Structure formats: C-alpha cells, structure tokens
Amino acid sequence: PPSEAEEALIKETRLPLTGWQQEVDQGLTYGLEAAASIKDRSIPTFSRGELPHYAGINTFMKAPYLEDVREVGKYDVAIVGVPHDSGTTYRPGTRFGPQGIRRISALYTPYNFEMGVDLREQISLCDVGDIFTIPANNEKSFDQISKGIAHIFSSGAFPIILGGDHSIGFPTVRGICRHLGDKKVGIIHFDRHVDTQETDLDERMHTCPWFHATNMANAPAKNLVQLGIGGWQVPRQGVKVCRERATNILTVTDITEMSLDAAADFAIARATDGTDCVWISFDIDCIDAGFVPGTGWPEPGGLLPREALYLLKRIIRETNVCGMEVVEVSPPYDISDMTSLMATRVICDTMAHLVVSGQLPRTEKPAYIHAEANMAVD
Amino acid sequence: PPSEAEEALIKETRLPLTGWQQEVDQGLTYGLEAAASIKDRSIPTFSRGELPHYAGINTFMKAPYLEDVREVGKYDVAIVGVPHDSGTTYRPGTRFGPQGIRRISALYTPYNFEMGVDLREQISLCDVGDIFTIPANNEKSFDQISKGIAHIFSSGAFPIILGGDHSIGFPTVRGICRHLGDKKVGIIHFDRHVDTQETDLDERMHTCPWFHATNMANAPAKNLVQLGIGGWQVPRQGVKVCRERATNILTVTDITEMSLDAAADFAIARATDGTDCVWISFDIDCIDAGFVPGTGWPEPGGLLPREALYLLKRIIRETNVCGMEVVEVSPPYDISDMTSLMATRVICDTMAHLVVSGQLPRTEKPAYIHAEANMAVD
Amino acid sequence: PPSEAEEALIKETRLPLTGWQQEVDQGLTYGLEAAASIKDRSIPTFSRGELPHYAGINTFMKAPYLEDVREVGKYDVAIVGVPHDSGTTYRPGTRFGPQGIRRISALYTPYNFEMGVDLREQISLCDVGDIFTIPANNEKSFDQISKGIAHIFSSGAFPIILGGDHSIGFPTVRGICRHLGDKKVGIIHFDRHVDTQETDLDERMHTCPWFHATNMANAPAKNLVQLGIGGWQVPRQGVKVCRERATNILTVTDITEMSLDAAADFAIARATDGTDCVWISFDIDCIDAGFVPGTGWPEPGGLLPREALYLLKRIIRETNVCGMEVVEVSPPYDISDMTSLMATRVICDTMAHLVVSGQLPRTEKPAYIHAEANMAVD
Ligand SMILES: C[As](C)(=O)[O-]
Ligand SMILES: C[As](C)(=O)[O-]
Ligand SMILES: C[As](C)(=O)[O-]
Ligand SMILES: [Cl-]
Ligand SMILES: [Cl-]
Ligand code: NI
Ligand code: NI
Ligand code: NI
Ligand code: NI
Ligand code: NI
Ligand code: NI
C-alpha cells in the first residue's frame, strides 16, 4: 500500500498552475517586470501576491482584499475578522486575533502537501477585512457581527471567522440562523470550556454563547457537540445548563481513551442528527496551553495539535459545513505568533478538507440558504 | 503672543472635513450601513477606513492600497516598503521594518495637532506595498529597489521609503539620480554612523551607501550632511572617506552645544549649496538607544526624540525635498513597536512639514524630474 | 529485565574520571586555587571549565576554543558555527543560531544518564568558532562554508555544524564531497519541508540545498531521505523535483502510523543503499512549532521531541555518519532559548550515539576521506 508521501507526490501532479500563472501575470502588470539582473522573469519589481512571504500587505494568506463587500458572493470563501474582546473574563487582547492570524498566515503557501490541495488553483478566496466591533458595548458589537456574517453567509460565500473571543459564537450563529429558514444547524464546538452559562459579569460573555445560540429554534442544544471539556475553568452554571439541555460532551480523556476515530464518529452522529448543516466553532484553548500561550484561558492537558487536526480531518470531510470560526487567539500574550500559527493551520486545513470532500467550490447555493432575513430568530 | 496650543485650536478650524466625509461615504457603501442598534450612522458594518484603529488591513495609516503601481503618479505621496536586510552587519530583522511601521501606524489619525495639518484633507496618500527584495543577493536587491523608486519618483509622486537597512540608501538615491538629468541632490543623513566606507564583509552593506551614492555625479559628497555621528560603532574606513570627500558632519555634542537651530542652519546651507533638491535618509538609530531598542546598531547618547523632531521641522520646511527613507527599524528586537512608532512619527511629521511649507500637494512636477532614465548614472 | 534507570546506574560506574580530573587541575593552575573559606578544593578562584554553568566564556558545552583551526585534526569532534541567514525566505535571525546554541549549552554536563556516556571522558571536543559568512552575497558565503567544512572534514575531525539556515546544506555537503573522491554520501534530512527546488527569490536559498547537493555525483538523490515532510509550506516546485529524482519521503503521519522503528528502518535502508557514509541534516522546524518557536518556518503537527530523539537513536547508531548540521535555530524569535535547547539536545544526543556505536573516537581516518580537494565537485 502507498505511503501518504507517495500519494502526495501523485496528487501534486494533478494540480494545475493556471492560478499561479494568473498571479504571476497580474504581478508583472501591476508591479512592473523585475530589474534587468533578475533571472527569474516571473518576479516583479513590486511584490504583488504570495512572494516574498516576509513582504507585502498582510491580508490572510495574501488573498485578494475585497473592499466592496457587496461583491462577496463572487468568492468561494470569505475570510472575515471579528476583532472583539468585550466578552473576555480574564485576559483581553483577542481583538488583535485577526491581525496576528493574518500576519503569520504570510508564512503559508496555498498548497497542502499531504492533501494534494492548492487553494489558489481550486477555490476563489477573499479577505473582506474586519467587522466594525464596538468595544464598549458587547451587545452592539454582537449586532454588528450578526449583520456582517448574515451578509456573507446569505451571499453564498463560505464564511471563515477570525476571532475575537468566543462570545461571538452567539452573534455569528445568529447571523447564520437569520438565513436558515426552518433548517437546523448542529454546532461542533472544540473547547475546554462549555460556554453555556446565561450571563457572566452581568453580560453575555464568552462563557455564554451557546446558552443564547441554542435558545434559537434553528440551533438545537441536543445537536451541540463539545469536544475537549475539562480542567479548572469549566463554570458550574454552564455545566448545569449542559445537563439540563442534554448537550453531547467528551473530555480529553474520553477522546484519547475511545480513539480519535470514535470521538469524531460521536461528534458527526450527534451534530448531524436532524440538522441540515454544521457550524464549526474552534476555541484555540482546546489545544494544550504549551502550544497556545497567546490566549485568555489556557489550560494544561488539552489536545495535542495532531489530535485536534485529525479530528478536524474526520469531521469536516463528513459533515455539511456552513461556516467556521476560530476564536480566542490573543497576540499580546503570544510568542512569535505560535498561537496565531496554530489557528491559521486550523483555518487552512478546514478549507483543504472542504475541497477534498467536494464541499468547495460550490456548484450552486446550498439548499439551507434562505434569501430573506429572519430578524426575530433571537 | 499666542501659545502653540491656542494656535492649534485656530488652525484646526481652517481644515476641511470633505476628506473625512468622503471616507465615511465610501465606508458605508463598501462596508454596509451599521446594524440598527448603532446610533452613530457614520459607522459601517465592515471596517473601511481609519476606524477602528485596532481593526482592518494594515496599510500605512490605513491609507489606500495602490495595487496598480503604474497609476502611482495620481497620488501626492507614495509609501513604499523596502523589506531588505541583506546589508546588516550585526542583527538582521529590519526586512520586517515596513510591516512593523505599517502595524503601529494604525494608531495615528491623519491629523497633527500642533501643525494644524490633516493629511486626509490636504494630500492624496497611497501605500504601494513593498519592493520585491532579494535576500540572498544584495546587489540584485539594489537593482529592484532602484527600479521601483525610480518609477515612483519619475511619476511625480513623492516617495517615502520604509526600510530596510541603510544599504538601501545607495539604490534609493541611485533611482532618484536616474531621473535627475543634470540636476544635483543633497543628502541629509541622520545617523550615529557615517555609512561611507567602500565595502564591508566583502559587499556594499549598510556601512557603505554614501561611498557609492556620492560616486554618482548627481550626488556630491560635499553636499552630504551627517547629523549625529558618534559612539563606538563609527568605522575608521568610513571616517577616512568622510575626510577625503569633505562631508559635513556634526556630532550629537556639536548639535546640542551649537543649538538645534544652528545645527539645522548648518545642514540647510551645506546640503543645498549647488543642489536642486534634498534627500532625507533617517537612520532610526540616531535616536538614543533607550528609545529605539528595535534596531540593529543601537547606541547610547543619541538624539532625544524632541531634538530629532525639531531638526526635521527646520530642515524639511526650508529645503526642497525630493524623497525620504526611514531605515533600520528591526521589529524582532522591538518592544511593543516602540521603535516602529518612532519611525512612523518621523514619516508623518515629514509629510506635515511638506504641507506646512507648501511643498505638497505639488501644483506641477518639479524641474529636477526628467522623464528618461539614465541607467548609467552608476 | 532491567529498567533503563538500573542500567544507567551500572553504566555510570564504567565511566572514568580522568577527563574530569584533568579539567580540575587545569582550572586550579589557570584560575588559581579558591579562597580559604571554600571547602571544596577542586574549585578555582576563576571559573575555568564547566562550572559554574551560568558563568564563563560561552563555547559549546564550554569545550576548549581551538583558535588555531589548522590543529583541528587533533580533536574527535569540532563544533563549527555557520552564522548564515542570507538564505531565509521569511524570518531571518538564524545567523544568531550558533550563539543561541552556545549560550544554552552551558546548562549541559558532558554526561548523559540514560546512555552512560561522558563526552569529557570518551572524546576530545573543540569549538572552532564560526565561519566568516557573507550576509550580502549568499554564494560567497557558500564558498566560505564549503572551504571551512572541507578543512575540518579532511582533517579527520567529525564536523558538527551549528546553523544557520538550511541553504547551508548545499555548501556543507559540497565541502564533504570535495574530499569523498568517488565515494557516495546518503543524506538523512529531518524536516517538514523538502528543500529541493532550484531557485527561490532568484537565488539558492534554504528551499534549494538538495536540488544542488544532489546535482553532485557524490550525493545521489535516490539516497536522500526526508523525514517529516508536510504542512502548508512545502513548495510545489520542490515536490516536483522530489518526484522526478525519486527521493525517499515519509510524512509525520507515515512515521507515527508505521512506528518509529519502521520509519528508522526505512531511513537506514534507503540512505545507505550504495553509499559509503551518511550526512545528517536536521532542520529544527521538523519538531512541532510549540517546541521550537525560535525558527523561520514553524509548522504545527510536527514530530514530538521524544519521537525525533528516538529516530536519531536508531539512525545515528546504525549508519556510518560523516558529519551533522542542525539548522534554522533563530534566537530572536525564541523564548528563553527553548529552541536552541532542542538543537543542543539533538547535537549532544548525536555525539553520544556516535560513542555508543563505536564511531567515536575514531581509531583511524575513514576510508572515504581523500586528502586532495576536488574543487570541481559542483
Ligand atoms: C470562550 As472560553 C470561556 O472557552 O475561553
Ligand atoms: C546603516 As548603520 C551602519 O548607521 O546601522
Ligand atoms: C530550509 As526550510 C525552507 O525547511 O526552513
Ligand atoms: Cl501586521
Ligand atoms: Cl551569549
Ligand atoms: Ni470557548
Ligand atoms: Ni475555551
Ligand atoms: Ni546607524
Ligand atoms: Ni545608517
Ligand atoms: Ni524546514
Ligand atoms: Ni529545511
């Protein structure tokens, strides 16, 4: 049987280079041809595109910036930043999450070796910039986030959210549900913390989004799957709510003891039972603190990177995913963007899994996307 | 007599707000109107422009990104990054100078209080991104730098260069000189180090730019003015060239003892005697090391910030400036972008002085700008 | 069966103390006897040797500095720094790799518990300092590196290279091949990235060493083994070359799925099939990013430290090793020398494996070392 590396060499031969050539040609047109001493004539004078990695304006993966967000429906994937840390109960700083993730994402090429995916060749990706968050008023910021996510989601572009603390899980899912009609969404929640209590410090903070998300008809608590719960920061009020609403929880010990495949099976079966799509909400602190120091609620004994990445491989490829957020990256507490890099890897792997499973590019808008907004979902 | 504060309050009333309103209107068009709960209806859903400062894609001061650099002649000022550290003889890292400067420049408004300047109302500014530098070949990187700066300069846009180590002083000035025809450029060089030796570690490094710049006819060494020379890092080979070529040098003690006004008088008279424009090359390490830890060659006993900024006030307002570079910011060695912030202040102050002295916007392209490039200037 | 701890207790009794005593006597002669209040009369007034760990001039493991590099043939092992980061395509700073490794290596004793090796008793080790690298000209720096490694290698001393970015893989191996005559060297390459493309940013950078090494007759691509390839930074151009030249690749998943012993078996069989010795090129970024933040190309999902160290145990002990380099340690991005410490552990473990397997000390110069330099190998 062939090794993963042998398949990767074969898969790479199947990838085109038209996307790369178009980047080269645009670069030479917009950035001039290189000086006479440069041998490689694909190089421009001015950096325009991927190279050099240390150079250029820092959109996510140096994807095109989409200034006119009304055109977002023309893209397969829209990276959207949510610079929001008004829901943080310990360290703030994740309002800079989007910046840190964009910054370190310059390290990446659009090509994933193991999967034989090249995003520059296989999807159209844009970076729409950031939601205009409201730091002094969590609820107004919620309303901004929901309006923007509902905009991107209803356009048909697949939304990838750069958080931002996890309180945004309520307004993002609320934005989705405004266009779900009567369809239901299962939430697959990677986290050490249940995030299901009603209020915290008298407000709807990052410990609270799934209390309020699953108050919506379109988001059944019975379809909330919570992978990695454990430690000394799981609030007892949230635990009570999980028990009363019958959410589906696995601890890190559960996951490693039952095997990753059985853990993903559990999540796939529970999240899709009676729903039409799945929302992926990935808290970067579900990874062991030694890998993600740049976060508000680090906890030892979390998932190791390859464990979380393998769970995503199983779950993304075998569910109908309608969107994703990666939350709680807090650059001011990071070292050399280690934590932003972990988040970037989750984001890019997810896109690659959507491509491998044929979910992107979409050949038509999904059945669950309703055009008219249901402004009273919450 | 009126205080600077009293004058500042009056100067502000003279500034328009059409540039601000135009930004607001573009923002609402491209970024949608805000959600219903937001009272201030100049706020969009998606950040598009200055606000929020912590959000958005990080161009310089969040200025417009000019993807098509062939259109650069339509702007009064073009910010261009030169992510180049193949000339560093101690610490590398200033290839990230442009990124660090861009990142912390989100902190600034276009408005300077003391000077009554608002760059959003009074000039057109763009960020053209970065030169495609060549880390493994300093001379090829020179050729890229010269071609790109010559493009911007000859278009009529005023170039501001984000370094990048100071070796780029040779190719930047070489790019200007390709279009100076029979005109001369005086160099006003803020630095602890003379940067005038022939080679270092067998190449034309950041200790060498003015040896090779002043080999060109268009850039007389007798018009090189070097402000702040001193310390334990001034190489004896460079000192020999300064003496043999009769450059104009003031130490920090010279400057503080003769007074800042006399120091600027000295610089203005020597740089312009027989020249038609002046090039400002500002090494961030001319500031005392305690203010600029993010640099390759820190040195105690440098200029204090208000001293360097006052010199710029005098020199920029009273010379015909053709461009500026701010070099040697090295973010990997910085703390909370302290050094990038110092560089940003120099950049923005310079723009404001160009506006106060009526050098920008230009009512016509300057006499010294020739259309045809003289590829044999060096 | 006896536990590893029990064997370690027995192995320690087999180690001599002549090397320790000689250090003590030199220290007292050169550093004076201690003040009268010091009970332990093996302590000098001036630190001379291992102790104290926090004190002293920072050679590697506080080994002797060999000022006269012409005498290197008298030592079993020569540590040589290659402070070269002109091949870096994202973050620079690994020109300080040798300094970072030297600094944190003060923490180590010459003695390894599990293996019962004491390098102070069983080999002669020197630190010859650094190659005079050329930051502004990658190719000149290559020529310096090749000349120096060729000097050490042909002397009979076992070369251990402290990088320095991985572009040095070409000039280091080229230096070896200048003295291999008609013998072949298999390359065992620990890395997430293939490093096999022809040029990058128009030059022979750290993505390119094995394209050019395996152009040499003495270094067959068919004997290149690449352990750990994967992620989003493997360039498609390099993947092409691996496929066309039939290099031998295992991904991280391959390695963990087939077992470490089977992966080492695979590496041993492929690298030694038709070669006379093996070159170890260890990119520190093959370790998961959470352990090596101080590097230019971190990538999540890499090898865990005990996995990489066990592979080295199997590979070093069962191949005829002619030298080793550990590359891409970049101290400016490190935290408390965590990454330099990992590199030091790889280096010291390797020496212990060479001693355990009887490869060091050498009782005679190896058959593959030819005295005359073959300056046209490339
Ligand atoms: C949003 As949380 C309380 O899991 O850091
Ligand atoms: C460019 As310098 C030698 O003054 O840091
Ligand atoms: C030498 As590399 C491109 O694997 O850091
Ligand atoms: Cl940034
Ligand atoms: Cl040190
Ligand atoms: Ni959470
Ligand atoms: Ni959490
Ligand atoms: Ni200087
Ligand atoms: Ni300088
Ligand atoms: Ni690597
Ligand atoms: Ni490598």
PDB file of C-alpha atoms in Angstrom, chain A residues 95-244:
ATOM      1  CA  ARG A  95      -9.355  41.867  19.468  1.00  0.00           C
ATOM      2  CA  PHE A  96      -5.951  41.551  17.778  1.00  0.00           C
ATOM      3  CA  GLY A  97      -6.557  37.908  16.877  1.00  0.00           C
ATOM      4  CA  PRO A  98      -7.372  38.764  13.244  1.00  0.00           C
ATOM      5  CA  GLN A  99      -4.190  40.775  12.884  1.00  0.00           C
ATOM      6  CA  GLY A 100      -1.983  38.056  14.349  1.00  0.00           C
ATOM      7  CA  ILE A 101      -3.584  35.356  12.209  1.00  0.00           C
ATOM      8  CA  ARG A 102      -3.257  37.480   9.067  1.00  0.00           C
ATOM      9  CA  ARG A 103       0.342  38.314   9.951  1.00  0.00           C
ATOM     10  CA  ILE A 104       1.593  34.755  10.427  1.00  0.00           C
ATOM     11  CA  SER A 105      -0.521  33.422   7.564  1.00  0.00           C
ATOM     12  CA  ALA A 106       2.041  35.018   5.219  1.00  0.00           C
ATOM     13  CA  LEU A 107       4.187  32.001   6.048  1.00  0.00           C
ATOM     14  CA  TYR A 108       1.831  29.682   4.159  1.00  0.00           C
ATOM     15  CA  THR A 109       1.543  28.755   0.508  1.00  0.00           C
ATOM     16  CA  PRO A 110      -1.908  27.887  -0.874  1.00  0.00           C
ATOM     17  CA  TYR A 111      -0.739  24.276  -1.237  1.00  0.00           C
ATOM     18  CA  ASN A 112      -1.053  21.462   1.331  1.00  0.00           C
ATOM     19  CA  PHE A 113       1.374  18.604   0.714  1.00  0.00           C
ATOM     20  CA  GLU A 114      -0.426  15.679   2.437  1.00  0.00           C
ATOM     21  CA  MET A 115      -3.804  16.514   0.897  1.00  0.00           C
ATOM     22  CA  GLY A 116      -2.764  17.480  -2.639  1.00  0.00           C
ATOM     23  CA  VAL A 117      -4.817  20.670  -2.360  1.00  0.00           C
ATOM     24  CA  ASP A 118      -3.826  24.056  -3.802  1.00  0.00           C
ATOM     25  CA  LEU A 119      -6.319  26.735  -2.788  1.00  0.00           C
ATOM     26  CA  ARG A 120      -5.019  29.180  -5.410  1.00  0.00           C
ATOM     27  CA  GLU A 121      -5.904  26.616  -8.073  1.00  0.00           C
ATOM     28  CA  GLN A 122      -9.106  25.158  -6.638  1.00  0.00           C
ATOM     29  CA  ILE A 123     -11.150  27.945  -4.974  1.00  0.00           C
ATOM     30  CA  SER A 124     -11.549  31.696  -5.040  1.00  0.00           C
ATOM     31  CA  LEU A 125     -10.647  33.174  -1.665  1.00  0.00           C
ATOM     32  CA  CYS A 126     -11.040  36.736  -0.472  1.00  0.00           C
ATOM     33  CA  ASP A 127     -10.315  38.669   2.699  1.00  0.00           C
ATOM     34  CA  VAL A 128     -13.161  41.110   3.407  1.00  0.00           C
ATOM     35  CA  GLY A 129     -11.325  42.719   6.315  1.00  0.00           C
ATOM     36  CA  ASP A 130     -12.885  43.162   9.749  1.00  0.00           C
ATOM     37  CA  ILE A 131     -16.246  43.695  11.349  1.00  0.00           C
ATOM     38  CA  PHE A 132     -16.540  47.163  12.921  1.00  0.00           C
ATOM     39  CA  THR A 133     -16.840  45.939  16.519  1.00  0.00           C
ATOM     40  CA  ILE A 134     -17.930  48.115  19.456  1.00  0.00           C
ATOM     41  CA  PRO A 135     -15.523  47.531  22.366  1.00  0.00           C
ATOM     42  CA  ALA A 136     -17.540  49.453  24.945  1.00  0.00           C
ATOM     43  CA  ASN A 137     -20.857  47.653  24.273  1.00  0.00           C
ATOM     44  CA  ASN A 138     -20.831  43.866  23.807  1.00  0.00           C
ATOM     45  CA  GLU A 139     -24.431  43.776  22.540  1.00  0.00           C
ATOM     46  CA  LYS A 140     -23.974  46.471  19.874  1.00  0.00           C
ATOM     47  CA  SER A 141     -20.867  44.591  18.761  1.00  0.00           C
ATOM     48  CA  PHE A 142     -22.986  41.421  18.590  1.00  0.00           C
ATOM     49  CA  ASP A 143     -25.422  43.239  16.310  1.00  0.00           C
ATOM     50  CA  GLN A 144     -22.564  44.326  14.040  1.00  0.00           C
ATOM     51  CA  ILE A 145     -21.153  40.779  13.873  1.00  0.00           C
ATOM     52  CA  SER A 146     -24.548  39.190  13.108  1.00  0.00           C
ATOM     53  CA  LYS A 147     -25.301  41.680  10.337  1.00  0.00           C
ATOM     54  CA  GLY A 148     -21.940  41.072   8.665  1.00  0.00           C
ATOM     55  CA  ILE A 149     -21.952  37.278   8.991  1.00  0.00           C
ATOM     56  CA  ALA A 150     -25.547  37.145   7.773  1.00  0.00           C
ATOM     57  CA  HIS A 151     -24.424  39.246   4.793  1.00  0.00           C
ATOM     58  CA  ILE A 152     -21.538  36.944   3.857  1.00  0.00           C
ATOM     59  CA  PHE A 153     -23.493  33.746   4.591  1.00  0.00           C
ATOM     60  CA  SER A 154     -26.526  34.726   2.526  1.00  0.00           C
ATOM     61  CA  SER A 155     -24.300  35.672  -0.402  1.00  0.00           C
ATOM     62  CA  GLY A 156     -23.264  32.025  -0.829  1.00  0.00           C
ATOM     63  CA  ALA A 157     -19.636  32.603   0.159  1.00  0.00           C
ATOM     64  CA  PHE A 158     -18.359  30.249   2.833  1.00  0.00           C
ATOM     65  CA  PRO A 159     -17.571  32.357   5.930  1.00  0.00           C
ATOM     66  CA  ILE A 160     -14.401  31.813   7.935  1.00  0.00           C
ATOM     67  CA  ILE A 161     -14.336  33.941  11.086  1.00  0.00           C
ATOM     68  CA  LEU A 162     -11.110  35.057  12.780  1.00  0.00           C
ATOM     69  CA  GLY A 163     -11.899  35.860  16.406  1.00  0.00           C
ATOM     70  CA  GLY A 164     -12.203  37.518  18.634  1.00  0.00           C
ATOM     71  CA  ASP A 165     -13.329  35.914  21.894  1.00  0.00           C
ATOM     72  CA  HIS A 166     -15.862  33.119  21.961  1.00  0.00           C
ATOM     73  CA  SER A 167     -18.789  35.311  22.957  1.00  0.00           C
ATOM     74  CA  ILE A 168     -19.021  35.938  19.198  1.00  0.00           C
ATOM     75  CA  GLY A 169     -20.329  32.378  18.822  1.00  0.00           C
ATOM     76  CA  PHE A 170     -23.776  33.722  19.604  1.00  0.00           C
ATOM     77  CA  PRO A 171     -23.903  36.611  17.050  1.00  0.00           C
ATOM     78  CA  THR A 172     -22.173  34.588  14.317  1.00  0.00           C
ATOM     79  CA  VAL A 173     -24.611  31.676  14.664  1.00  0.00           C
ATOM     80  CA  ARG A 174     -27.447  34.190  14.997  1.00  0.00           C
ATOM     81  CA  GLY A 175     -26.294  35.696  11.678  1.00  0.00           C
ATOM     82  CA  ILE A 176     -26.357  32.234  10.078  1.00  0.00           C
ATOM     83  CA  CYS A 177     -29.776  31.437  11.544  1.00  0.00           C
ATOM     84  CA  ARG A 178     -31.275  34.646  10.115  1.00  0.00           C
ATOM     85  CA  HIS A 179     -30.994  32.927   6.722  1.00  0.00           C
ATOM     86  CA  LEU A 180     -31.653  29.302   7.704  1.00  0.00           C
ATOM     87  CA  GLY A 181     -35.438  29.487   7.406  1.00  0.00           C
ATOM     88  CA  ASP A 182     -36.636  26.309   9.114  1.00  0.00           C
ATOM     89  CA  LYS A 183     -33.357  24.406   8.716  1.00  0.00           C
ATOM     90  CA  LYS A 184     -31.346  23.449  11.800  1.00  0.00           C
ATOM     91  CA  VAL A 185     -27.605  23.752  12.393  1.00  0.00           C
ATOM     92  CA  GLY A 186     -25.545  21.456  14.595  1.00  0.00           C
ATOM     93  CA  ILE A 187     -22.666  23.124  16.409  1.00  0.00           C
ATOM     94  CA  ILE A 188     -19.373  21.276  16.737  1.00  0.00           C
ATOM     95  CA  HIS A 189     -17.513  23.066  19.481  1.00  0.00           C
ATOM     96  CA  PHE A 190     -13.820  22.450  20.189  1.00  0.00           C
ATOM     97  CA  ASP A 191     -13.075  23.751  23.675  1.00  0.00           C
ATOM     98  CA  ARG A 192     -12.003  23.010  27.244  1.00  0.00           C
ATOM     99  CA  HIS A 193     -14.907  25.171  28.410  1.00  0.00           C
ATOM    100  CA  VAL A 194     -18.603  24.536  27.918  1.00  0.00           C
ATOM    101  CA  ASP A 195     -19.539  28.193  27.265  1.00  0.00           C
ATOM    102  CA  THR A 196     -23.195  27.525  28.128  1.00  0.00           C
ATOM    103  CA  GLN A 197     -23.980  29.757  31.088  1.00  0.00           C
ATOM    104  CA  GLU A 198     -26.539  32.560  30.848  1.00  0.00           C
ATOM    105  CA  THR A 199     -24.583  35.637  31.984  1.00  0.00           C
ATOM    106  CA  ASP A 200     -21.099  36.371  33.301  1.00  0.00           C
ATOM    107  CA  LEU A 201     -20.087  39.643  34.967  1.00  0.00           C
ATOM    108  CA  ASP A 202     -23.715  40.617  34.289  1.00  0.00           C
ATOM    109  CA  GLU A 203     -23.406  40.260  30.480  1.00  0.00           C
ATOM    110  CA  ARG A 204     -23.395  37.706  27.651  1.00  0.00           C
ATOM    111  CA  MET A 205     -19.675  36.980  27.656  1.00  0.00           C
ATOM    112  CA  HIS A 206     -17.514  34.279  26.130  1.00  0.00           C
ATOM    113  CA  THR A 207     -18.742  31.783  28.764  1.00  0.00           C
ATOM    114  CA  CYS A 208     -22.303  32.279  27.464  1.00  0.00           C
ATOM    115  CA  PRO A 209     -22.694  31.997  23.635  1.00  0.00           C
ATOM    116  CA  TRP A 210     -24.271  28.537  23.478  1.00  0.00           C
ATOM    117  CA  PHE A 211     -26.835  29.329  26.154  1.00  0.00           C
ATOM    118  CA  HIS A 212     -28.144  32.009  23.818  1.00  0.00           C
ATOM    119  CA  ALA A 213     -27.382  30.341  20.493  1.00  0.00           C
ATOM    120  CA  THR A 214     -29.372  27.243  21.480  1.00  0.00           C
ATOM    121  CA  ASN A 215     -32.265  29.401  22.641  1.00  0.00           C
ATOM    122  CA  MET A 216     -32.814  29.820  18.887  1.00  0.00           C
ATOM    123  CA  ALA A 217     -35.099  27.338  17.154  1.00  0.00           C
ATOM    124  CA  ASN A 218     -32.565  26.752  14.358  1.00  0.00           C
ATOM    125  CA  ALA A 219     -29.804  25.647  16.791  1.00  0.00           C
ATOM    126  CA  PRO A 220     -30.896  22.680  18.925  1.00  0.00           C
ATOM    127  CA  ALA A 221     -28.925  22.169  22.116  1.00  0.00           C
ATOM    128  CA  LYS A 222     -29.340  18.422  21.550  1.00  0.00           C
ATOM    129  CA  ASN A 223     -27.082  18.859  18.474  1.00  0.00           C
ATOM    130  CA  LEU A 224     -24.338  20.805  20.288  1.00  0.00           C
ATOM    131  CA  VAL A 225     -21.182  18.673  20.476  1.00  0.00           C
ATOM    132  CA  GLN A 226     -18.427  19.850  22.825  1.00  0.00           C
ATOM    133  CA  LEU A 227     -15.011  18.224  22.356  1.00  0.00           C
ATOM    134  CA  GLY A 228     -12.279  18.588  24.975  1.00  0.00           C
ATOM    135  CA  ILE A 229     -14.169  19.805  28.079  1.00  0.00           C
ATOM    136  CA  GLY A 230     -12.133  19.670  31.274  1.00  0.00           C
ATOM    137  CA  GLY A 231      -9.897  21.435  33.744  1.00  0.00           C
ATOM    138  CA  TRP A 232     -10.408  24.019  36.467  1.00  0.00           C
ATOM    139  CA  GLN A 233     -12.122  26.724  34.395  1.00  0.00           C
ATOM    140  CA  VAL A 234     -15.381  24.975  33.417  1.00  0.00           C
ATOM    141  CA  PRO A 235     -18.068  27.043  35.178  1.00  0.00           C
ATOM    142  CA  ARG A 236     -20.610  25.110  37.218  1.00  0.00           C
ATOM    143  CA  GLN A 237     -23.520  27.204  35.883  1.00  0.00           C
ATOM    144  CA  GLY A 238     -22.565  26.170  32.365  1.00  0.00           C
ATOM    145  CA  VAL A 239     -22.311  22.540  33.491  1.00  0.00           C
ATOM    146  CA  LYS A 240     -25.857  22.727  34.889  1.00  0.00           C
ATOM    147  CA  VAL A 241     -27.079  24.096  31.533  1.00  0.00           C
ATOM    148  CA  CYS A 242     -25.330  21.298  29.602  1.00  0.00           C
ATOM    149  CA  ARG A 243     -27.052  18.712  31.780  1.00  0.00           C
ATOM    150  CA  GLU A 244     -30.495  20.332  31.531  1.00  0.00           C
TER     151      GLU A 244
END
